[PDB]
Symmetry: C3
Subunit: 157 residues, 3 copies
C-alpha cells in the first residue's frame, strides 16, 4: 500500500519532468552519509553527449546556458533516482545546489543561468525541491561544458 503511494509519487515527479520536455537518462556519481545524498558535479549530458559547450557571454547566450543548467538538473535527478533505488519520492528536501557557469569576465548573470536548474527542480519536486544555492562564474569546465552543477539532497533512509 504505502509502497504504491511512493511508486505513485515517483511517477508524478517523472511525469512532470516529461511535461517539461525531458526524460531521465575512483570517484563515484554519489555518496550517502546518514540521510544526506551528495551528488557529484553533473554536466549537460543529453543522448550521451555534452549538449552545450563554451563560455556564457562568448559562445553561449543565457537561454542556451539555461538549457544547459536544465540538463545538469536532469542528470542530478537521474543520479538521485539511482541512489534511491528507483524512487524519487524518497527525496525529503533538495538541500543545496552549487551551480558552476563557464563565463567570460563580463558575464554577470550566472544566477539567471542556474535558474534553469532551480526552476526545473522546484517544478518537478514541488516544495521539497526548493533549495539553498550558490551560482558562480568559472574560467572553464570539463569537456568544455557551459554549466556543471552538484547537489546535496536529504533523503528518506
Amino acid at each position: 500500500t504505502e509502497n504504491l503511494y511512493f511508486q505513485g509519487m515517483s511517477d508524478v515527479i517523472e511525469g512532470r519532468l516529461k511535461e517539461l520536455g525531458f526524460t531521465l537518462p575512483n570517484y563515484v556519481p554519489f555518496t550517502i552519509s546518514g540521510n544526506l545524498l551528495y551528488v557529484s558535479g553533473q554536466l549537460p549530458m543529453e543522448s550521451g553527449k555534452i549538449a552545450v559547450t563554451g563560455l556564457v557571454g562568448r559562445d553561449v547566450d543565457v537561454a542556451s546556458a539555461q538549457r544547459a543548467a536544465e540538463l545538469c538538473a536532469v542528470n542530478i535527478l537521474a543520479q538521485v533516482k539511482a541512489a534511491l533505488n528507483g524512487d524519487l519520492s524518497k527525496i525529503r528536501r533538495v538541500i543545496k545546489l552549487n551551480g558552476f557557469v563557464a563565463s567570460v569576465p563580463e558575464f554577470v548573470e550566472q544566477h539567471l543561468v542556474i535558474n534553469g536548474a532551480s526552476n526545473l527542480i522546484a517544478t518537478v519536486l514541488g516544495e521539497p525541491g526548493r533549495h539553498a544555492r550558490a551560482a558562480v562564474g568559472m574560467a572553464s569546465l570539463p569537456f568544455n561544458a557551459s554549466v556543471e552543477i552538484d547537489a546535496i539532497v536529504e533523503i528518506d533512509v
Copy 2:
C-alpha cells in the same frame, strides 16, 4: 531565564558587530537557507549594503585587496542576517560555523584570495568567538552574479 540568557548572547553578538561598523540588514525556487538536522546551509551571499551590491568588479583590476576585504565582510554580514532569520532572531543558537566557501572575482594574476576572504573570517570569528572559527575554501572566479567582487556561502551547525 534560558531565553533571557539566549537573548543576551544574541545582543552581545550583534553589539560586537556594531563595534566593527556593521548593522544587520533585513537581507523564488531557491531559498536563502535550508536546514537538514542541525546543519543550516546558507546560500551564496553577495556584498549587499542598503539593498545595493557595494563592491563590484574583479579583484586585481577594478578593486584592490582592502576593498575586496570590505566586500567579504559584507558577504559575512549578509550570512549572519540569514542565520538570524533561520534561528528566529537568535544568533546565540549558532553552535559552530562549520564551513565558508569564499568566491572572489579575480583576474588570473590575482592570487591573494585568502587575504580577501580573511575579511569575512575575521569578522565572523570576532563577533561569534571560538564558535565562529570555521573550515574554509578561498578561490578565484572568472566573474559573479551582479558583478559582485565576492560571494560567500556557509554551513552552520545550530541548536
Copy 3:
C-alpha cells in the same frame, strides 16, 4: 584493546600505501578542519611540499596535465594530513570520503579539469580502498591563493 591495535594497524597500512606512491605526510580565525556529528570538513588544501607551494600557475599555460595531476596528489596528501590530525593519528577512522571539491587554476581553453583532479581521486582511492571512493566536483578557476595550480577541499565521514 587489540581493537585499538587493529586501528593502529589499519593506519599503518594506509600511510604505508601512501609511501609506496612516493609521499610522506607533512606535519588563525579559520581552521584546517571542523567536525559536526560524524562529518569532518577539511579546508581547501594547496599543493604543499616541504613547506612550499610545489606547483604554480594556470593549467594549459604554465603547467601541463601531468604537472597539475601531481599538484592534485599533493593537495590530497595535505587533505590526509589534516584528517590524520582530526582523528588523533588514526586514518583508519575514516569511514568514507564523502566529497572532494577540486579547483583547478585554468586558462579558458583548458577543459581537462577531471583529469587533473583524477590525480587526487586515484591517490585517495588507492591508499584508502573502497572507503576512499568519493563524490566529486572538478572546475576551472581564474586563479588560486599563492598561485596554486590546484586547491581541493573534502568532506569525510568519520
